[PDB]
Design a protein around this ligand. Structure first.
Ligand SMILES: CC(=O)N[C@@H]1[C@@H](O)[C@H](O[C@@H]2O[C@H](CO)[C@@H](O[C@@H]3O[C@H](CO)[C@@H](O)[C@H](O)[C@H]3NC(C)=O)[C@H](O)[C@H]2NC(C)=O)[C@@H](CO)O[C@H]1O
Ligand SMILES: CC(=O)N[C@@H]1[C@@H](O)[C@H](O)[C@@H](CO)O[C@H]1O
Length: 292
């Protein structure tokens, strides 16, 4: 029982952990550690500039947002069979949870996830699925990107909620908090980040994956589309990337190209990204969006 999720089992989502690096590293090393995402999406998930190298620093005890695919079973959200940890010479399931994964999981959740019958015995070189806490669920019938937050000391629900642009209301109903007062340190919180709206269709492969809070960006459709989110509008801004193994992007009707707008204000209309499909070959779809 990590983060509650109530959507149909098998449903996948994009979620994240706010990861605290014990040691100094680089963004490149985080990518190798988690392998839940690509470097440019990790960079974009934190709002670093496009074309930043993997050697971008991560200071000791600094925090990096690490996106991953979440799978929901009946009741809870779990990171979808990633990340995969390889046991070193004298690891232990409890040390691994706490000192590698910030206590986002418990050793029991690890063992249960890998069918290990006595939490005390794991072999060198044994691989472990680490199921990070996540969802899935909507907030108020609005899409959100849940983020797993490890409460540092001196914090409170007021400050956190302002930090992420969330009402303190949703935080308390989503997280079981009797008396906020003083939040206990080390507590894991479900923080549903607001995200841009999109025109990405149900039928589309990336339908629940382009969930971008403010200031972040991401890539989709075999890296042929770039999507960015600003709170300025909260409408996903998509653009064609121009790798040249990439398919053409259709106009809307005729004459409106991706990102272009027709009309004036509020009643204006925009050629948006609505998804892609991959049977046979990569096809990108677009559709007119009304000003939201
Ligand atoms: C059909 C066949 O023989 N294919 C081989 C693959 O099975 C094998 O992949 C390895 O599989 C084992 C189990 O499939 C993996 O270990 C499992 O890992 C999950 C988390 O990843 C963990 O929860 C399971 O408990 C754990 N089970 C076991 C038995 O350890 C292991 O990670 C895979 N190794 C790699 C490198 O992918 C590959 C590897 O040789 O060979 C195929 O021929
Ligand atoms: C370190 C920090 O952020 N402390 C804040 C404090 O300034 C504020 O008065 C209080 C009430 O909301 O919340 C907490």
């Amino acid at each position: 029982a990590n983060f509650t999720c109530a959507v149909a089992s098998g449903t996948t989502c994009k979620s994240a952990i706010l990861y605290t690096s014990p040691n100094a590293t680089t963004y490149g090393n985080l990518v190798a550690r988690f392998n839940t995402t690509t470097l440019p999406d990790l960079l974009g998930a934190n709002g670093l500039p496009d074309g930043t190298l993997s050697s971008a620093p991560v200071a000791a005890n600094s925090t990096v947002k690490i996106p991953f695919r979440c799978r929901c079973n009946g009741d809870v959200g779990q990171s979808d069979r990633l990340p995969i940890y390889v046991v070193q010479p004298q690891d232990g399931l409890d040390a691994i949870a706490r000192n590698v994964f910030n206590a986002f999981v418990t050793y029991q959740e690890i063992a249960a996830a890998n069918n290990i019958p006595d939490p005390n015995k794991i072999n060198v070189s044994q691989t472990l699925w680490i199921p990070l806490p996540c969802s899935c669920d909507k907030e108020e019938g609005s899409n959100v990107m849940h983020l797993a937050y490890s409460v540092g000391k001196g914090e409170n629900t007021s400050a956190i909620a302002a930090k992420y642009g969330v009402t303190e209301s949703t935080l308390l109903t989503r997280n079981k908090i009797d008396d906020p007062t003083k939040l206990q340190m080390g507590q894991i919180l479900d923080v549903p980040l607001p995200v841009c709206r999109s025109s990405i269709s149900d039928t589309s492969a990336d339908h629940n994956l382009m969930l971008l809070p403010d200031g972040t960006y991401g890539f989709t459709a075999g890296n042929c589309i770039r999507c960015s989110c600003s709170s300025t509008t909260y409408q996903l801004n998509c653009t064609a990337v121009q790798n040249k193994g990439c398919p053409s992007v259709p106009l809307c009707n005729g004459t409106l190209k991706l990102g272009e707008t027709n009309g004036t204000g509020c009643g204006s209309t925009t050629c948006a990204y609505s998804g892609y499909s991959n049977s046979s070959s990569l096809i990108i779809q677009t559709s007119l969006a009304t000003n939201q």
